[PDB]
Amino acid sequence: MEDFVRQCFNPMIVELAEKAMKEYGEDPKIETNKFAAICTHLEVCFMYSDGGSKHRFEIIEGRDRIMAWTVVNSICNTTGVEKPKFLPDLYDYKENRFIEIGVTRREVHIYYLEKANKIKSEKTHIHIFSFTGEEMATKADYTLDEESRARIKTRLFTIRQEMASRSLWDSFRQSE
Ligand SMILES: O=C(O)c1nc([C@@H]2CCCN2C(=O)COc2ccccc2)[nH]c(=O)c1O
Ligand SMILES: [Mn+2]
Ligand SMILES: [Mn+2]
Numbered sequence: 001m002e003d004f005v006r007q008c009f010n011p012m013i014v015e016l017a018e019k020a021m022k023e024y025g026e027d028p029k030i031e032t033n034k035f036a037a038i039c040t041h042l043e044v045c046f047m048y049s050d051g052g053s054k055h056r057f058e059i060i061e062g063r064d065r066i067m068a069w070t071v072v073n074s075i076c077n078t079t080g081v082e083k084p085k086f087l088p089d090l091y092d093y094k095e096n097r098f099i100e101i102g103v104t105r106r107e108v109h110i111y112y113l114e115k116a117n118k119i120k121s122e123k124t125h126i127h128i129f130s131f132t133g134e135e136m137a138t139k140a141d142y143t144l145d146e147e148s149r150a151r152i153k154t155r156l157f158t159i160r161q162e163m164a165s166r167s168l169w170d171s172f173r174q175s176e
Contacts, residue, residue, distance in 0.1 A: 001032030001168055008162060009039045016042055016062050033175035040159060041103045044129060045089055047152050048101060050144055058091040061101070072098075084124050092125070092143065099143070102128040103156065105173040108136035129153065131160035 006014060017038040018028050028035045045061045058075065060068045065087055075091050076083045081098070088098035100119060104111035108128045115126050116138075127143060128136040133153045135142065142149060163169040 001036055001172075002029055004163065004166060004168060005032075005036050005039055008159065009043065013039050013042050013046075033172050036163075036172060037103070037175075040156070041101065043155070044103050044152055045101055047148070047155065048090060048099070048127075048144065050148050054093075056092065056094050057099075058093065059089075060087060060091065060098075061089040082121065082123055084119075084121060086119065088124055095125070095143065098124045100124055100126050102126065104128060104130055105176045106130075108134045112136045129156055131156045133157050 005017075009017075017035055020038055021028050021031070021034060026034060042062050045059055048059075049057055058071065060071065063071075068087055072084065072087065072091075075081065079096055081096060084098050086100075089101040090099040091097075092099055100115055102111050102115050108130045111130075112126055112128045115128070119126065125141070125143065126136075126138045129152055133156075135149060135153065137143065160169060163172055
């Protein structure tokens with residue numbers, strides 16, 4: 001999984017995932033499935049953009065969580081949007097709402113429901129992606145155009161297929 005993660009993901013993404021796990025008392029080399037899951041979730045957050053023109057999305061994920069909260073505060077003060085109780089993944093400057101991104105090896109609908117229960121607030125948008133080319137979003141609002149989401153689904157499916165050829169997929173699917 002390590003050898004796969006180092007080869008499959010960008011070195012900056014690998015460095016961020018190593019920090020997040022060591023920060024939470026877990027080592028990248030034993031809980032290898034968490035290593036790959038954190039790398040994949042980070043990548044999806046980076047691709048969550050229409051890829052053109054303005055900086056529509058503030059990426060909250062992948063940053064020092066203490067510092068990321070000050071950014072959420074600054075947005076809420078300027079925008080007036082209610083403050084989320086849990087640190088979201090992105091903020092949409094066009095729709096003026098926070099986004100929680102989910103990447104699951106389980107089903108998109110059951111993973112959305114768990115997120116919605118935990119989020120509690122109806123204001124934070126939820127967008128779930130799977131490794132099987134499916135997605136689920138709040139009120140069927142997928143935020144991005146279909147080509148941007150197609151890039152994410154194909155990348156996730158590509159990750160899924162690359163793991164499967166190395167016999168790593170089934171264990172990665174069961175770790176969740
Ligand atoms: O998408 C998601 O599932 C998602 N989940 C979380 C959960 C909530 C509790 C803390 N936590 C984390 O994973 C915090 O990092 C960790 C935790 C354990 C090991 C390594 C890193 N946080 C999100 O920001 C997020 O996007
Ligand atoms: Mn997050
Ligand atoms: Mn997330």
